[PDB]
């Protein structure tokens, strides 16, 4: 099973120069908790953008060319990047934009967090066709000392 996590923030932006501009703890740690113990996929750019490997996961890179760091896994098509994971019961893509776009049609869950913020970006996430999905998970929380804008948790599921 493929499933998408993204955190979106109006329009569906989730990037501007290779970044993600705001700060959320709370949703973090959401990322965290499900992405812990299973295979991540993600393009070069958003490779870049972390910046190091996610510990307790296993990091595959999507990238045309060679690889450049050998403490994660790099291949060069999606059906390689499935493959690469091995028979898990759930693979996270975690980006970014061209990534996401490749692997939606190929998934059957969306970890989505809606976030409550306006920024000025250039990647955004997947137009999807909402008929297409069931909302099975919402929680709503309003923004704390810790995390400037509200938030919403949501897990959809290919109807
Ligand atoms: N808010 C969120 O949830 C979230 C999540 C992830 C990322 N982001 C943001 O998204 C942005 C990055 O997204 P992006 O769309 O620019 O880039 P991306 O999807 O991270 O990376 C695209 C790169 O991945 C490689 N790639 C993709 N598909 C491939 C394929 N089928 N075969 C081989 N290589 C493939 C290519 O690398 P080569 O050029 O090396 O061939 C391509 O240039 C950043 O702003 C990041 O902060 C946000
Ligand atoms: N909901 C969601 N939020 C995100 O921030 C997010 N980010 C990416 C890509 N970028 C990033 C950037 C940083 C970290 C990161 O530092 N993760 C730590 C945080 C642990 C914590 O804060 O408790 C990790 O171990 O996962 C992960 C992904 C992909 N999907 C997402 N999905
Ligand atoms: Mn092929
Ligand atoms: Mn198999
Ligand atoms: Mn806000």
């Given at each position: 099973?493929?499933?998408?996590?993204?955190?979106?923030?109006?329009?569906?932006?989730?990037?501007?120069?290779?970044?993600?501009?705001?700060?959320?703890?709370?949703?973090?740690?959401?990322?965290?908790?499900?992405?812990?113990?299973?295979?991540?996929?993600?393009?070069?750019?958003?490779?870049?953008?972390?910046?190091?490997?996610?510990?307790?996961?296993?990091?595959?890179?999507?990238?045309?060319?060679?690889?450049?760091?050998?403490?994660?896994?790099?291949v060069?098509?999606?059906?390689e990047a499935?493959?690469?994971?091995?028979?898990?019961?759930?693979?996270?893509?975690?980006?970014?934009?061209?990534?996401?776009?490749?692997?939606?049609?190929?998934?059957?869950?969306?970890?989505?967090?809606?976030?409550?913020?306006?920024?000025?970006?250039?990647?955004?996430?997947?137009?999807?066709?909402?008929?297409?999905?069931?909302?099975?998970?919402?929680?709503?929380?309003?923004?704390?000392?810790?995390?400037?804008?509200?938030?919403?948790?949501?897990?959809?599921?290919?109807?």
């Amino acid at each position: 099973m493929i499933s998408l996590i993204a955190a979106l923030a109006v329009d569906r932006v989730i990037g501007m120069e290779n970044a993600m501009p705001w700060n959320l703890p709370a949703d973090l740690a959401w990322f965290k908790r499900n992405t812990l113990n299973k295979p991540v996929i993600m393009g070069r750019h958003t490779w870049e953008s972390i910046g190091r490997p996610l510990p307790g996961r296993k990091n595959i890179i999507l990238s045309s060319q060679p690889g450049t760091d050998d403490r994660v896994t790099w291949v060069k098509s999606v059906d390689e990047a499935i493959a690469a994971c091995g028979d898990v019961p759930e693979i996270m893509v975690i980006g970014g934009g061209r990534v996401y776009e490749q692997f939606l049609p190929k998934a059957q869950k969306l970890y989505l967090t809606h976030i409550d913020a306006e920024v000025e970006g250039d990647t955004h996430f997947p137009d999807y066709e909402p008929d297409d999905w069931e909302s099975v998970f919402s929680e709503f929380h309003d923004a704390d000392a810790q995390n400037s804008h509200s938030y919403c948790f949501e897990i959809l599921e290919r109807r």
